[PDB]
UniProtKB/Swiss-Prot annotation:
One of its GO terms (molecular function) is lyase activity. It is found in: Secreted. It catalyses: an [RNA] containing cytidine + H2O = an [RNA]-3'-cytidine-3'-phosphate + a 5'-hydroxy-ribonucleotide-3'-[RNA]; an [RNA] containing uridine + H2O = an [RNA]-3'-uridine-3'-phosphate + a 5'-hydroxy-ribonucleotide-3'-[RNA]. It comes from the Eukaryota. Glycans are attached at K1, K7, N34, K37, K41. The keyword Hydrolase applies. Endonuclease that catalyzes the cleavage of RNA on the 3' side of pyrimidine nucleotides. Acts on single-stranded and double-stranded RNA. Pancreas. The active site is at H12 (proton acceptor), H119 (proton donor). This is Ribonuclease pancreatic. Interacts with and forms tight 1:1 complexes with RNH1. Dimerization of two such complexes may occur. Interaction with RNH1 inhibits this protein. Monomer. Its EC number is 4.6.1.18. Substrate binds at K7, R10, K41, P42, V43, N44, T45, K66, R85. The lineage of its organism: Eukaryota, Metazoa, Chordata, Craniata, Vertebrata.
Length: 124
């Protein structure tokens, strides 16, 4: 079984590199993280930070999630992230992505005991 927290890790965590190594990073990662299995996930963000530092955001700044839910939290510090979004070339099973490096505050939705991130919401 993959808990929501385990899923958050697979879909969004990548402590292995300090930033996207190439313009081809997203194509490689979207595939290895199984995000192109039954369709091409349209957009996905990877966080290049320790899991401990990301988990700590659940006890930082409480803000509203994009859908109006209230269980979202914003990081005080900026974090190294990579934005992956489909290009016009993308057509399942040939999913294609644009890789974009950024340094922004992250917003995650938290849930549970322990209270940890379970959904990546936005970046500001």
């Amino acid at each position: 079984k993959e808990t929501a927290a385990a899923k958050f890790e697979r879909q969004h965590m990548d402590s292995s590199t300090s930033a996207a190594s190439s313009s081809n990073y997203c194509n490689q990662m979207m595939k290895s993280r199984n995000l192109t299995k039954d369709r091409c996930k349209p957009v996905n963000t990877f966080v290049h930070e320790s899991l401990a530092d990301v988990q700590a955001v659940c006890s930082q700044k409480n803000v509203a999630c994009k859908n109006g839910q209230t269980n979202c939290y914003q990081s005080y510090s900026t974090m190294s992230i990579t934005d992956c979004r489909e290009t016009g070339s993308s057509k399942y099973p040939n999913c294609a992505y644009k890789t974009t490096q950024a340094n922004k505050h992250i917003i995650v939705a938290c849930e549970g005991n322990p209270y940890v991130p379970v959904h990546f919401d936005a970046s500001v």
